[PDB]
Amino acid sequence: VAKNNQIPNDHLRKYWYHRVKTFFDDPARAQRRRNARNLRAKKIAPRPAEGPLRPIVRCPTVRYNMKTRLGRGFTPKELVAAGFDPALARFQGIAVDARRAHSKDAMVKQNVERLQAYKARLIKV
Amino acid sequence: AKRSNTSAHNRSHQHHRNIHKCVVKKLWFEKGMNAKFLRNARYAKAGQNK
Amino acid sequence: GVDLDHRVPRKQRQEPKTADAQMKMLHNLYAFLARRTGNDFNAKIAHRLCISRTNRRPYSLSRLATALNGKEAETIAVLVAKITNDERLLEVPKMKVCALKFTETARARILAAGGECITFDQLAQLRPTGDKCLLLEGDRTRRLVNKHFGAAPGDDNSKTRPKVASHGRKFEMARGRRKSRWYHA
Amino acid sequence: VKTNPFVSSQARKVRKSYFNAKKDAKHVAMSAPLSKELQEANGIKRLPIRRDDEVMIFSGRMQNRTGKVTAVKLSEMRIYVDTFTTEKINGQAVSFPVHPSNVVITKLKMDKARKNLIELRRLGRDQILAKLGH
Amino acid sequence: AEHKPIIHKKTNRFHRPQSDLWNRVPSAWRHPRGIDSRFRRKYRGTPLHPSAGFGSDKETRFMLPNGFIPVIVRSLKDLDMLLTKNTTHGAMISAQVGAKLQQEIIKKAQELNIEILNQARKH
Amino acid sequence: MAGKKVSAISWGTGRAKACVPRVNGSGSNRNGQGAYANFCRGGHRFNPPTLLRRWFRPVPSRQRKFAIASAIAATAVVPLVQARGHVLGEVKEVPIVVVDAVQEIKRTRDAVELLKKVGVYGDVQRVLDGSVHRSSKGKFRRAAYKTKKGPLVIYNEDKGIVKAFRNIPGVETISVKALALAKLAPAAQVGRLTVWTESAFKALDGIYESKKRFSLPRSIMTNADIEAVITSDAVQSVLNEKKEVVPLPKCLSVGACEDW
Amino acid sequence: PTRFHKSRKLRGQVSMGFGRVGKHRVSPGGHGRAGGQHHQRTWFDRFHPGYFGKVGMRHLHLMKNRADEYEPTINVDKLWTLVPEEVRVKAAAAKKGDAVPVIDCVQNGFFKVLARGELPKIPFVVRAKDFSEEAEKKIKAAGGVCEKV
RNA sequence: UAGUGUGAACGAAAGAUGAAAAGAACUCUAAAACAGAGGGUGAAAAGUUCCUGAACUUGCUUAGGGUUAAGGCUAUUUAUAGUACCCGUCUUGAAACACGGAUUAGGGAGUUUAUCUGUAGUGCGAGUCUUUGCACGUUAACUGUAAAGGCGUAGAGAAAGC
RNA sequence: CUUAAAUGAAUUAGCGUUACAAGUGGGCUCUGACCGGUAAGCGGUCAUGGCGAAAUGGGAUGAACCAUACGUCUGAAUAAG
RNA sequence: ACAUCAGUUCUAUUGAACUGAGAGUAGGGGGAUGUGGACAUUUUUGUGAAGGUGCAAUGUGAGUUGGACUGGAAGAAUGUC
RNA sequence: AAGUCUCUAAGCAAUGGAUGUCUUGGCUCCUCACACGAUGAAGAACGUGGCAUAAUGUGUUAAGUAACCGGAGUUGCAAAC
Predict the structure, then answer these.
(1) Are G and D touching by the rule of 3+ CB pairs within 8 Å?
(2) CB A97 within 8 A of CB A86
């Protein structure tokens, strides 16, 4: 300890120098990810690769009430209102979530209209 | 074991390399002084500007 | 054998330590004037161009509106710094300004109220004497590093702010800072 | 510039692969141009050399002689020839090795594989010059 | 050209201390840092230290016994440097440059009047 | 774990040897030899390059976008391009823009026939004659001769143009959409000779208008040079007269000392 | 990098800028913050006073998305910064009537409002969670409304 | 691997003829696969752990000095005059009867990472950073970009509340 | 606010302020003053100087005393002696 | 008389004229030399590269350069890293 | 007042293996893979080639044999095809 510097706070008393993790993989990791999702989208064809379709969902705590994000899946209530079969709708390319039941009336009207726009121009081979 | 206790041989030398005169900012020291005096010295200033 | 004090206490910056063309160039313009015209205005502008970037503090646009309120037209606010606009000032006056750089927010504001956006080599043609000019400067001690400077904290009373990562209770608020825990500075 | 990643452009790796190639690649590496009498006849410039045929070297001590190939050598990477002999200090002729890329092939002897190689490269050279358009 | 009489101020090279004695120690100068060193102290019967005192005149620095300041010349293209300063500087052709290009640089120099300081290569 | 593979315990004082670590065992002759120290033969070296080390410098993205702007500015301005080391000759104007039908060039006869007509093939001849050697040991690991970096060619889109210019020494193709410092200003030396396409060249005001964080950098001066400003009569009237130093004599000053 | 270091110029100099008599060695003081109440106390006392000791009330399970910790603040002088500048110029030219623009603080992530500086005399409506006493006073005096959420 | 120890274990040194063996026939002295000398091969002996072949040490030849241990520096008419204690090191103090140092070559010691401090340079500026990642690529680079997040923009108090 | 009258010792000199950091925290000593001791080239203090980090000349010889503190050279006249 | 480092009078574009100073351990600052590799730019080399041995210059100096013998294939310069 | 001795220098050698130039070897980073074994693995021993000690192939079918795929001598001497 010397001079006017702030108290010496370095969390380096454990043998960190044995447990090192260098990230020279990162741009090669990017290609292993990227070559996977191209070898996906060929095998998934003719189905749309950006799917499956997911609901709009409000974030929980006080400082994210503003924002709205993608959820996990639509409720069995929201599918039946829109005109779908809850079990079979997984294989039509719509993610389904049985658990969520705190979504109030305003965000249901989005997600019904979201599924109707999908079901309007879904077609079958 | 037994080394020297002190010296002042070249205290004078070091002091004179630079006895800088530390100047006072103002003669009043309002932390001290009578509160009863300074209390009235506020109401002299406050009444004047109005 | 001669009795002199050979040491230098005071260096002073003579020419700028930047490796630009343009800052080195228009230093020599105002160095040339400061010698030859023999004037207090141009001597200052010459020296301001020498000095490091920390001392050239960014003189904001609301301070510029306060200075020029009173002063009549054809009066340039010369300013060896960057100008940065204030959000909180709402309607800018129409004002003539000279500085090294503006921020692109500030240049929009000054031009949109019929102002002027003058460079230093442009100003050397207009006003060599600096007649109806107005030199301004930002305050030196407005930097955050400057608040750590002074008597060491704990001198009763330093008012100097100790160098700390994390603020709150728990970090440097007990034995020294308050009279309950032994002593107060 | 190469696009194929799996071929290496380091000098260490290429020399090691070259000297320790398989037997089939080393025969192809040992090759030479034909003389212009044989180029118009067979319709190819470049061919790999066998113990049948004979060859003719410009520039050397052994300048401008024909002579048949006694032995190819793939480890030593050179060709022994008839005629190409200095004597020792003892009265004994010893055949002297020469690298084929200095040398022109003056006569050739057919093999089923040699005819089958030539008919491929003739048909290949007709396609490529039509593509480039000379 | 016209100049002063050249005078050097020191004739010989400076040796390192104790370099005469030992073969491990090379005779290139090194400033002695020994605490008890006689040489650092400057006693009598030590060599004088190399120092700005011994600096030659600003006119006559790098100047040969001939007159001219030697610029090194590595090719025919580098000989254009001496075209401006003809009778102050002068040419000095490199040791790398072979016998054929030696003769071409002399032939180029005799046209342009630049005195070549290299001498007696031979043959 | 290099140089510490050996066993080694350091003997101690008493034996009239230095206290450095010494490999143990018998009969090898290797044994009883100093090891494990930087000064010892086959010891661990003092701090050779680690993975720990920081390699990559995160240079701020405004200052990256600053430098490609200033390099493209410098690709004009004919002092700079020859001051790098080019043989542009005549025509002497820079930059060179070319009509967009050259973007459909396929074969390399046509690409070579392009450059000599627009007057750039002087710089390609600078590459072809006069190779450049590697004095260093770098020759073992990266080819004995280097090659010169000649012209540059820019196109908005590729129609086999890249294939055509590929293989000609010294010419580097880029898209206008990419751009880079390593191409435009190699070894930090601004002004490479650029051969723009029309469709590339007309994009640039569209590009630098609609870049998100970046905005286009201002100068401090309005003019290029000072000398017009000082020599003007607006300045000159205010100046004092140009002084010059007297040299002083070395020597009877006074008119009558003989009265005394 | 390694060229520009002071170490590079100190070849020949025997100590490399670290003294003869003292001898530069690895543990002068002791490790890290050691001897803070003993032999390095002068450093702690002089530069970081109040370091030693316990103060305050323990807080268990502190979360900062609660509306107890989390209150971002904004000031009365601005607010108008949140809206673009075409809006309030139209709002300046208006009667005592209609079309008074709603400056939503809560969308932009500002819960409380705090009067440090001035306003103009434009009408407006602040939607926010909370106010100060003086911030509520200044918004009235400009000629505008204080909504709560 | 050689090699050491009953054993667990320990563990070296050692690359380069020339383009191609054309790797030195045959003769003479000699007891002679001792060792040379002639004569040859090759562009050149580079002649078999053979490219270049440094220093220490040694041999031969040439030239000077020598009662002053030798060496150094200054000055000249070149063997004289004057001068000159042995470097490195801890030390108040080293020529010391303080310690290290027989000779020579090659190795041989303030470097890098994290969290910060302050000064100077650079870009933007009430903002700023584009990186986790996605889209590009002549592909680890470079280039483009959405949204969060970091630090800054308001602080004091143990805390409530402000 | 203003009514009066001036820059009212010598000699010298630009003065003020901030930031970052090195080494150091064993000293020794001449001439005087002094405490302890029979005394010490002994131990512990004080004032200016010196050495340490200061060559050169002088005291034959010497860290400390006297003259004097130094770029490389060429002269003149001196200091201690 | 000459060199260096300060300063004073001036000077656009890097300079001019003139004045003053000279110890230095621990330690600090400024400018410069050399080595392994890199990116540009420019070359040299079987009419003999690097290396090595002696000699003559040149720089205050770290160094650098010439020519002779030896050697038999690569080296170096300028600016940045 | 002697020297073949001893001291110093230069030239030609002996000894020694530095310097310089070379590089089918390392080191690291990234990629792909892990499908060994009672159907006898990994490891050990000894055999076996015309001249073969180590290593590498290989197991009395022992530098190999059969089938399919390559397709003409992959090195000193000798021998066969």
Answers:
(1) no
(2) no
Q: How many residues does chain G have?
A: 149
Which residue out of G31, G38, G41, G43 would a mutagenesis test of the A interface target, given it has the greatest number of A Cβ atoms within 10 Å? G43
CA–CA distance, G98 with G88 (Å, rounded to integer) = 14
Q: How far apart are CA G64 and CA D17, in angstroms?
A: 64
Q: Which two tokens stand for residue E79?
A: 């000989």
Asked if F81 and F193 touch (Cβ cutoff 8 Å), the reply is yes
Smallest CA–CA distance, residue G122 to chain A, in Å, is 28
Taking the C-alpha atoms of residue F108 and residue F106, their distance in angstroms, rounded to an integer, is: 7
Q: Which residues contact E41 (CB under 8 A, 6 or more apart)?
A: none
What pairs with residue E73 in β-bridges?
E93
Distance F163 CA to K23 C1' (A): 36
8 Å CB contact between G117 and G139: no
SS3 of G114, please? strand
A24: closest chain F residue by CA: F51
Residue F172 contacts residue F193 (beta carbons within 8 Å): no
Helices within chain D (DSSP H only): 11-19, 23-29, 36-42, 112-132
The stretches of chain G forming alpha helices (DSSP H) are: 6-9, 41-47, 85-92, 105-108, 133-142
C97 close to C117: Cβ distance less than 8 angstroms: yes
Chain E: residues touching G (Cβ < 8 Å): 30-31, 33, 35
Contact D94, D88 (CB under 8 A): yes
The answer to whether the beta carbons of residues F8 and F23 sit under 8 Å apart is yes
Which of G51, G52, G77 is the closest to C88 by Cβ?
Answer: G77
Q: Does strand I come within 7 Å of the CB of E48?
A: yes
Q: Which of A56, A32, A60, A53 minimizes the C-alpha distance to A108?
A: A56
Chains in contact with F via at least 3 Cβ–Cβ pairs below 8 Å: A, C, D
Using the CB atoms, write b or e for B2-38: b if 16+ within 10 Å: eeeeeeeeeeeeeeeeeeeeeeeeeeeeeeeeeeeee
The encoded tokens of residue A94 equal 């719509």
> What residues of G are in contact with residue A63 (Cβ under 8 Å)?
65, 70, 109
CB contact under 8 A, G65 and A61: yes
User: What Å resolution does this PDB entry report?
Assistant: 3.2
Chain A residues with beta carbon closer than 8 angstroms to that of C163: 4-6
